[PDB]
Ligand SMILES: CC(=O)C[C@H](c1ccccc1)c1c(O)c2ccccc2oc1=O
Ligand SMILES: CCCCCCCCCCCCCC(=O)O
Ligand SMILES: CCCCCCCCCCCCCC(=O)O
Ligand SMILES: CCCCCCCCCCCCCC(=O)O
Ligand SMILES: CCCCCCCCCCCCCC(=O)O
Ligand SMILES: CCCCCCCCCCCCCC(=O)O
């Protein structure tokens with residue numbers, strides 16, 4: 001139209017508009033105080049109301065970037081607090097915004113956000129609901145400069161909902177706490193996937209990304225024509241390139257147009273897009289990106305017809321390699337919603353290696369005639385891992401299951417830091433209780449989703465303070481061999497056991513007076529240290545000690561003079577245990 005703000009204000013709503021503007025400013029001016037951002041918000045909202053009333057009013061013709069950039073340069077302490085960034089204000093708009101993007105500190109040094117007591121939170125919420133939500137919308141956004149703004153809004157509303165429901169509940173904490181812990185994890189996971197998708201698009205390039213997308217989109221929209229999926233994969237590539245660059249406005253419009261395109265062609269893509277297409281602007285694309293897989297056509301041919309048997313396969317492949325390979329993916333992915341995306345990529349990659357060496361020899365048709373038998377071991381490997389590990393988790397519980405993984409991984413990379421091992425294992429455990437809950441049909445996709453962030457988390461840490469070549473190998477390998485590389489790690493035969501430290505195995509009464517989470521972590525910590533000291537301990541020998549300890553604790557956290565029990569009996573435990581572990 002004639003006025004951008006006016007238009008955005010109208011099909012967004014005053015409430016949503018003010019929240020997004022706050023997020024946007026908090027993501028650039030990460031150092032300014034809350035009271036300051038609220039003022040800017042009010043000022044931009046007022047200005048916006050002016051344009052809604054009269055599209056010809058002053059400045060209402062200016063573009064969003066221009067308007068956004070002029071207000072940013074308004075801040076007086078800009079140069080004194082942000083330094084270089086202030087020199088951005090000296091350039092012509094096109095470069096000005098580009099300049100601002102370059103200075104968006106992805107990770108500032110702000111104190112960790114501490115969760116206050118349920119009672120102080122609930123009371124604050126009742127006293128002033130609005131500033132309570134905005135204050136935290138602000139604290140989160142400033143710490144996560146690249147989190148796509150609208151999604152952050154979606155999390156804000158889920159937090160408001162948890163307070164509404166829980167602050168009225170009889171037992172506040174039993175209600176609110178678990179919901180908040182739930183929100184945090186999903187929030188941190190969403191943030192990790194976002195950063196990951198951008199990282200991958202930079203390291204491995206466009207082709208790899210497009211392949212991941214074709215597979216993913218084909219499972220989702222199995223009824224769509226290949227030309228339709230290619231079309232969407234193309235736009236999705238543009239969309240994420242821009243969104244990764246960090247330009248919110250640019251990102252938002254590309255996503256909007258795409259969401260618009262999909263809904264208008266709704267019948268030619270998926271039947272399950274009905275709901276999502278009914279929702280308002282702000283929510284369309286979010287919904288679509290999360291929609292359930294549609295049902296695959298009941299009448300689908302065998303892949304071997306067009307990709308193995310049919311002579312002249314090499315003719316179609318040489319005609320246009322990636323297109324053909326893309327069609328392979330499309331066809332294979334839409335018949336297998338139960339496969340993880342990387343598995344599909346492994347299959348596609350195997351096919352490529354085959355067609356490459358087979359199309360350059362005597363009788364092609366017979367060289368690549370087998371290929372589908374190449375897939376079997378590839379498909380079964382992740383499947384066996386899934387059932388083996390889920391069975392085990394059903395036997396032991398989440399906690400005792402975490403302990404098993406703990407012993408297994410400490411033995412494979414004893415060089416890693418204990419607190420790192422404890423965290424990684426605990427998270428591997430969660431993926432276990434989250435995913436083993438699903439029918440075998442939705443398991444592999446479930447693990448892939450969660451395992452991808454945990455493995456990326458693991459790598460980043462390790463990147464900071466490297467400790468094992470093996471870990472570095474897997475972490476720098478192709479994103480398709482990442483998990484398989486960690487799966488292939490074997491017990492470290494080299495490792496020289498840590499020498500005994502009396503303290504490391506000394507326990508007091510505090511452990512009795514602690515919470516579940518903290519008790520476990522205390523126990524789990526001693527367990528990693530144990531294995532590092534005697535890495536040759538048998539699952540049996542080890543289980544023997546864990547049983548004595550299990551009791552030992554009990555005996556002392558139920559005995560009169562606890563101070564000495566943990567000291568007299570502790571002497572015994574440690575001494576005996578060492579005797580049994582040689
Ligand atoms: C994590 C996801 O599976 C999101 C999905 C996707 C598919 C292929 C490559 C990357 C991401 C996805 C979107 O990011 C999206 C954004 C705007 C509009 C529609 C969208 O649809 C989608 O399926
Ligand atoms: C999350 C975006 C919306 C802001 C509302 C958050 C309100 C809950 C406050 C708790 C946040 C502290 C994070 C944590 O759980 O450790
Ligand atoms: C438009 C179609 C583009 C898709 C290209 C298909 C390529 C399949 C190869 C598998 C990719 C594995 C990733 C990699 O090795 O880089
Ligand atoms: C200075 C004007 C600030 C305007 C704030 C940006 C507008 C956000 C619109 C996002 C629309 C949702 C699109 C989508 O992701 O599906
Ligand atoms: C499923 C819960 C158990 C936790 C252990 C994860 C086991 C799944 C491993 C398979 C990973 C699928 C991704 C891939 O294809 O490599
Ligand atoms: C904290 C560093 C220790 C590294 C632990 C490796 C993480 C294991 C992830 C691989 C999951 C597949 C399960 C398996 O095959 O073992």
Ligand SMILES: CCCCCCCCCCCCCC(=O)O
Nearest residue numbers: 505523526527546549550574577
């Ligand atoms: C040689 C030192 C002997 C002491 C060993 C301490 C035992 C550490 C493992 C504790 C974990 C037990 C598992 C549990 O019951 O939760």
